[PDB]
Design a protein around this ligand. Sequence first.
Ligand SMILES: *[C@]1(C(=O)O)O[C@@H]([C@H](O)[C@H](O)CO)[C@H](NC(C)=O)[C@@H](O)[C@H]1F
Length: 625
Amino acid sequence: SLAPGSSRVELFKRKNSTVPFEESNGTIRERVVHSFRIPTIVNVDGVMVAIADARYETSFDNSFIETAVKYSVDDGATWNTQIAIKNSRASSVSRVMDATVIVKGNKLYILVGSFNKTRNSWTQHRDGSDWEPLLVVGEVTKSAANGKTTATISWGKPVSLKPLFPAEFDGILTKEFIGGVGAAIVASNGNLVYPVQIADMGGRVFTKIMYSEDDGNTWKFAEGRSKFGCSEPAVLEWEGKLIINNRVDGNRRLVYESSDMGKTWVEALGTLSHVWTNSPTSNQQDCQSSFVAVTIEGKRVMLFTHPLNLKGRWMRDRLHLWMTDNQRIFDVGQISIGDENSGYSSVLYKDDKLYSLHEINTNDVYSLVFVRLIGELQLMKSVVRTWKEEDNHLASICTPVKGGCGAAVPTAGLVGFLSHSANGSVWEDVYRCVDANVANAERVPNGLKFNGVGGGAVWPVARQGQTRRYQFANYRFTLVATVTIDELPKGTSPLLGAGLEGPGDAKLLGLSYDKNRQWRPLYGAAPASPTGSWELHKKYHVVLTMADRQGSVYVDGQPLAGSGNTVVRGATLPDISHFYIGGPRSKGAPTDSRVTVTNVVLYNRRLNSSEIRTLFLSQDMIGTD
Ligand SMILES: *[C@]1(C(=O)O)O[C@@H]([C@H](O)[C@H](O)CO)[C@H](NC(C)=O)[C@@H](O)[C@H]1F
């Protein structure tokens, strides 16, 4: 739960917080609001701006709603309250909802869906006639009298973008669109970039980019899109690419990349796609997430929020915050309290302080809490320092060909590292994200010596459970280790590799050794024929690479026979259960591989010839012992 040091308040209080509702005649009355939903909090020029649905009468989507704002110039000491956007007043369920926000300069751009009288769900409408996509510009103005700083925000007249909306995309006939919800972006080229969600006539849902090159005068829909079934997209920019992180009801969350401003989308199979999901079993309603790029401790990272939803459906208990540098993925922790139902969420890093505005739900009455994430930021900084330190350390090792070293120890795409630190049953990731689980082992410099049944370590992949941070390995990986065989096996015994989920004891790619002192590389389901020669007690360098559905095993820098073969046949992504180190098993054959393994490194890409050599030549230099 919310860390020690951290605190929150109910900033938008259900059945309590009033908003200045304007009547038809133009008189203002403070009007109490049943539920506050769909939060975004942003910084505009030193001013915090918090945007929400004011669901006046009920929490239900197709009800009477207007866009509320609270803003502060003293970082949440005090707030002023507004309705930024009024609904049409056509009926008892007229609504403006699902605010998607862009900050450029002292301006906010708010995109909402406006509906007049439908009582059913937007994806289910018969046509788009009840609907309008509305753009509203706010301008923030500051000024100080008598020391004290004040601000005002003036909201312009909404503009419908309906006329900009094509009737068709690649033959698909369009119905409606809304923003993806939450904080969107100004790209590095100044483009206003909205991720949008689109419903076709059929009610299918897919996502796209809608962008403006001209501070919002005109708008273009880029050519690429998601698979059907993606909603409420969140976008950030990272190393010259848009990254679009999608809601997927009833399956795992799809993440795409585009480096041509949305024209071409490529699924992020090698980093973030299918890592996050809706529930432990992946078959539940999903939920909106915030997805924001920030710079912490001099390092650019992405921040991502989503409930675990252990309760299922819409309950959305146990809101977590993850932080990723697109290689490692760290769970900062649960930011909601206890088993409370949370929901939609927003996150903001401002003046070196970290905040969330998110939903809490009891009996489907919703407030929005404003959270000072004090302990979380402290942990985040520690983790970032660890990442920069070990990367700087590794990259600063002089490798054998001394200004006149070999190529640097590869660090780009280094996800994880198991070295000196270990206790009883845990082998610690140096990068502090995913540890290995250990049995029948004894500590040695930079690793472990296994003896007894199931002696070995399990570095979980699918076995991470819900959030699958090593999902990338199903698409590509390099696994590296330094090994000694300590005792001859009776026949054939395992050493290193990737196991597959499911019946049998199938492996994607692996290495075993046998009684005749030969190696037995395993390329998918192919027979694990012997090759080469080793001797007991001698240190070998082992590298496994898999990319483009092909695998290669290297010993002391050199590929073993069969290397380059196809390890996965078919278009279906492998499902790797774990990496095994030694012969771990909690069942089956009582494997007892007598090996010692140290310095196990995992990369989210197939390393090149020179990188492999460099690792082999630097074996002795990279340990944390
Ligand atoms: C979120 C929510 O799930 O709690 O759902 C949205 C949609 O119902 C959902 O994505 C189905 O298409 C709501 N909006 C609308 C316009 O229906 C969000 O406001 C929110 F309700």
